[PDB]
Design a protein around this ligand. Sequence first.
Ligand SMILES: C[N+](C)(C)CCO
Length: 272
Amino acid sequence: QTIKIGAQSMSESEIIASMLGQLIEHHTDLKTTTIKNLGSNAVQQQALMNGEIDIAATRYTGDALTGTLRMEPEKDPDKALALTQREFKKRYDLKWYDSYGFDNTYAFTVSKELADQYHLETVSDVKKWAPQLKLGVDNYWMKLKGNGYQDFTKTYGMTFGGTYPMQIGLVYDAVKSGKMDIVLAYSTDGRIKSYGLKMLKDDKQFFPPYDCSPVVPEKVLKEHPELEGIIKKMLGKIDTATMQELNYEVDGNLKEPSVVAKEYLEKHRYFE
Ligand SMILES: C[N+](C)(C)CCO
């Protein structure tokens, strides 16, 4: 009546936002709409504080610790989540829920062929090769201040010989085809498994945890007391394997995110 749910410009965020909206409409007389194409963690933040969205469907602890809170990035998942929950309530009167069950981290990714030829297992293993590698990346990370490229080169001490910003969606074919040698992929993309790509271990733990949760203002929860119980039904229920399969249905089987969400909810009987 009517609850506006924000989605970041990722297939994953569209699937989860549609799944949550469908679950609310299954249980209650609330109407839901989806506010798509929010560009970033910061965009979703300001939209929560100014009333443009009532629920942010997918927020990530690693994005909010650096970007929003300007805290030093905690590297343990459970600690990072508890610190995020605490500060979001204190600073913003926002409720950062427990995780849906999956984490979507940046991951340096190569073809199995390249990994096998040069015995690549970790990010540190590419240090000696960096000047000769072509890196594909999304359109934000090169300029990102927390754990973006600037800080990466300082921490790992390597600089790639060529950089190639593109829509996140495009990196998977770029690396499989061999047009790029290495890409900064998102770990829940379903093409990593389907294309047989190799994720390199972040041995320095340069990246923080990116556990995913819904975030809602306390004022919205007070006015709609049934929302809390509905959101709880999705928590702890969607593991990374499941999220990759759902992303695959959109990016590989070319389904609408609303259709992928409706078929999952039907298969799993709306979580009860
Ligand atoms: C959540 N990621 C780390 C994959 C992308 C930035 O929102």
